[PDB]
RNA sequence: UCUGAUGGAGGAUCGAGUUGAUACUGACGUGCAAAUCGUUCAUUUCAAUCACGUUUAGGGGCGAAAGACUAAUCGAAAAG
RNA sequence: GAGAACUUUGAAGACUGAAGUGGAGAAGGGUUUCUUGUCAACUGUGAUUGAACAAGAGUUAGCCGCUCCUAAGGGAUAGCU
RNA sequence: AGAUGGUAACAUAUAUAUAAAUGAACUCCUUUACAUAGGCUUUACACUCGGGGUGCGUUUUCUUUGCACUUUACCUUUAUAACAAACCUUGGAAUCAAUUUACUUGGAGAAGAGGUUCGUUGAACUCAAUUCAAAAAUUUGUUUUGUAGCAAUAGUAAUUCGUAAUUAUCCGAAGUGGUAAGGACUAUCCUUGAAAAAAGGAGGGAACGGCUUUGUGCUUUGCUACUCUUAAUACUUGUAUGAGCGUACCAACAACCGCAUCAGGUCUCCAAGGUUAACAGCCUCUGGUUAAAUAGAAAAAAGUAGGUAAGGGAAGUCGGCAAAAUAGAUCCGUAACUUCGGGAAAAGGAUUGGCUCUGAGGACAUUAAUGUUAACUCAGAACUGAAACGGACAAGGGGA
């Protein structure tokens, strides 16, 4: 069944440290933990490894990412204006 | 310890054979005397 | 030590020059099985024998250079 | 299968008797925990110098040796006599020493 | 006295120094003894034995 | 959204050991001991504990900071 | 044995209780090891005991370790002060 | 001038010994070589149960009984067998399927079927040799032997005989999960958890038979049984195997450091049984000990370390200091507050022994049906007792 209402994944820290500072890392391990898709196989499977690094669990093939995400939206951008030329 | 080094060992035999005492033959005509115990040799 | 299990091999390694002794073991079983140890320089080598026709023949018909050692 | 338990040694010294040692063996033996239901399974026949002791069930033959010291304990003799095997079918009062 | 021979005969006998045991006359003879060669010899013609050890049983 | 399992997270809990030292302001205080003993107590997945090796040396070091510690010596060691 | 509560033996009653006064090692010690003597002192009572004293003895490796490699790191070379 | 099998994964040298499958410069990799947590699993060792044998013990009475032994090293690429994985061939998946305790995986090729390899282990499996029948100018079934060799010759436990020898045994089936290691996994990190010696694999393709001979290492002429690899021997080579050092003992309990034969301190490994959650406590087997700078007697005060106390229950005291109070497990019940995670073992009730039973929870085969066999785990009921049962040990006082 439902075990938390609302606290998630941050029940590991029970009740310490701020709510604000759990909701602040829910939010953001939420997508840590996420599994991401990998452009090279299209199967959504890459996880990170370590902090700037993410593997495909398929293709075992490894790119450089976010902190806590496969991109970050100002690298994302980046990109774009660089292939829009 | 049992492992030892070839001089170290060679200095316990010496501290060893001096540790006897005078000869009776001599004494007829001593004080430097340790015991394991009591006078560590520190060497 | 090494098992060898065909009479042509054994008979080949007792003909080698290397080959020093043989030991002849003989134990009861249930009937007397017994064993021919050849003493190489390298290995012992071993052949059991259940027939003790086949066994009797064998040790006889080795030739006499090389050291006998009953052990029974 | 066929156990033997000679006595010859001892009985030509006169210290226990053959009748006695069967008797005891015919009612204390037990079968499916009773004492007296040898009936056809397990029988024990007697002789001048030995005990024949014929089962047909499986059977230790160490309760035989268990059997010979309760009666020479009970028969107080326990510190002169031992037991001991001599074939895979048989056991033989030694003396001691 | 005897400390060397209970020593040995725990030795030869492959059991502790506290299950041998000595014939408590014939102490003169088990004095003689101080080898393991002796302490063998008068194992065997039973001037020490080795004691049983405690029962410990499991029928509870 | 709810219920039952499964799962096995966490500077999570109890607790021996280890590592310490709350209280009795107990004993002892010509001690077993120039800091021990008894009971009690804190601590045990982590900023955890231990060993050896190695680095930092005196107006210097080292300090989750008490002027603490730096060989029973520290608001400036010890030796001459 | 001159002499025995604390030397040895046998018997008993118990203890330690595999987190052990049980087996193996390291650091440290250095002959305390072993056998035979043995008691002036020491072994805070005794002591014939002993890790004490005395005389002898005992440690065997191609395979167990060191030795080799490199680590935190140390020393030195070239310079330069 | 350098072998060969398989479609493939890959395999092949068994000579006493699987030694030789050409290969330079120059390169490129691999091994060495690595964290933590969690469970799952396999194996060995440990423990335990039953059977057989042998010995001992108990034996007023009971007891087909209680105890002990019943063993097997390294090495043989150990051969095989089995299994977690990975890979290959065929195959062609939605009604998606396979599958784990967990999730993991698949048109970048799943299931099914057939294989290859590594790694675990190390005689498993008829494994090896062997007896007997069907396949053909060598395969498949049935038996004997052997603890597979080591290996029984050793070890252990017994019975004897001059006092050194003979003898007999050393084999039938399982359960629990304690320790260790391995495996395949999952998870965690703003933490990603040595290096080198040393060894290996590969890419590349420099060099090239033998006897004799022209002339100047190069074209040449007649002839062919000819190169590498392991072992031994003989002679030359300086003497053509295996250096040096440690190895006793203690490791605290009197061998260390604390001025000592000091109740202190001081690193690592092994680790039995019972009760139990348990390497706890308590008792026990193996091993060890019965020793402590003393003994004997008496036994008042006082001290110290404890017990127990009628009635009251903190009036004591600065202060409940100290002690007492339950305290395990199961079932029930659980507030304010709250960062919604907690609070919480909140608070607070009930039960608990023994005995005799009842029910539930698995594995293994036969032609929808019937037998063989294993764990302790739960739940319920009768009876029983001086109403007692976490009986000792162990073990929260709670609340505002």
């Known amino acids: 069944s439902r075990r938390t209402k609302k606290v998630g994944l941050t029940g590991k820290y029970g009740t310490r440290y701020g709510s604000s500072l759990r909701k602040q890392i829910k939010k953001i391990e939420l997508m840590q933990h996420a599994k991401y898709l990998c452009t090279f196989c299209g199967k959504t499977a890459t996880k990170r490894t370590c902090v700037g690094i993410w593997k495909c669990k398929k293709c075992k093939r490894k790119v450089c990412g976010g902190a806590w995400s496969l991109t970050t939206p100002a690298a994302v951008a980046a990109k774009s204006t660089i292939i829009r030329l | ?43 | 030590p090494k098992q060898i299990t065909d009479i042509r091999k054994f008979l080949k390694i007792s003909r080698k020059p290397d080959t020093t002794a043989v030991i002849i073991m003989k134990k009861k079983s249930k009937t007397v099985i017994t064993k021919l140890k050849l003493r190489t320089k390298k290995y012992l080598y071993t052949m059991v024998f259940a027939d003790r026709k086949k066994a009797e023949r064998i040790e006889n018909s080795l030739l006499p250079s090389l050291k006998r050692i009953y052990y029974p | 299968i066929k156990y033997v338990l000679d006595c010859t040694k001892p009985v030509k010294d006169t210290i226990l008797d053959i009748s006695g040692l069967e008797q005891f063996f015919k009612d204390k033996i037990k079968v499916d925990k009773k004492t007296n239901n040898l009936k056809n399974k397990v029988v024990v026949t007697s002789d001048e110098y030995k005990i024949y002791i014929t089962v047909h069930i499986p059977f230790s033959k160490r309760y035989i040796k268990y059997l010979a010291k309760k009666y020479i304990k009970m028969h107080q003799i326990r510190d002169f006599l031992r037991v001991i095997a001599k074939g895979k079918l048989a056991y033989e009062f030694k003396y001691f020493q | 006295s005897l400390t060397l021979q209970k020593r040995l005969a725990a030795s030869v006998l492959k059991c502790g120094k506290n299950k041998i045991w000595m014939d408590p006359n014939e102490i003169s003879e088990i004095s003689l003894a101080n080898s393991r060669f002796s302490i063998r010899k008068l194992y065997k013609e039973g001037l020490i034995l080795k004691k049983p050890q405690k029962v410990h049983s499991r029928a509870r």
């Open chain 2, 1 to 43: 310890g049992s492992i030892k080094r070839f001089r170290l060992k060679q200095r316990l035999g010496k501290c060893r054979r001096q540790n006897r005492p005078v000869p009776h033959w001599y004494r007829l005509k001593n004080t430097k005397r340790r015991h394991w115990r009591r006078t560590k040799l520190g060497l």
